[PDB]
Amino acid sequence: GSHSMRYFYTAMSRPGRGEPRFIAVGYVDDTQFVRFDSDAASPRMAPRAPWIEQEGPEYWDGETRNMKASAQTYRENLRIALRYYNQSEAGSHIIQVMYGCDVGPDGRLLRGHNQYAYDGKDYIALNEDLSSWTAADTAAQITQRKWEAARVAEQLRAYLEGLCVEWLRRYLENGKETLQRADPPKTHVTHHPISDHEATLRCWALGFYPAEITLTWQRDGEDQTQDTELVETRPAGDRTFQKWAAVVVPSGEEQRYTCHVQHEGLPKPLTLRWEP
């Protein structure tokens, strides 16, 4: 299938409690592989997946350096952002960054991403063309003018089209046992009477990878999207994910309901019903 590499940075200020914390994590698809935390006893880019451990000292030292430099720059950016929004130095604020690349089955760049937020709201984003910017407000427009002046977009494009794709391909090859293996969901339906004339049907999907999945209830072949309780897909802790979808049905009408499961690991979509 297609794949993605993504990095997530969180820089959080904490006036009176030292310098802003910087945490970075890296992912291939739904698999985390590196971490950095400025609050660690000995801050460094550290492995979080077995297939990254084989990278040599140059990799880890380079990445550590890049992470510390990044942390400093984002502390400065927190100060700057304080200025741009006329905010006091007494409050805690957060800058977030998410970036990376998507490649197809042949390893070719599908597209790039490079997006920034301040206090949980869109700040500025590199457009899909990897050459122009979308700013969410006037402060972000100040940043945009700065970056247009310095041709930052070119450097980012150079990264996203070059190193990002190359190293993503490398990781996919080194971790092919896991990164290129889809685990299909194990599925089942449970039935719980809630009253004499109503019962809950719950369609379960467990142990699947990657996280992307679709669970839907149909009544007489018609989607019950509005009447379905759908929980957020959740991690099991063993790399796999879990999800369920529940519907409340009239007693004696259970067999008019079918659960439909779509997942990459399944050669064909599944249909299942309550089996008393």
Partner: peptide, 9 residues
Amino acid sequence: LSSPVTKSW
């Protein structure tokens, strides 16, 4: 591999 480009806002 992380991005080597991090600029001031």
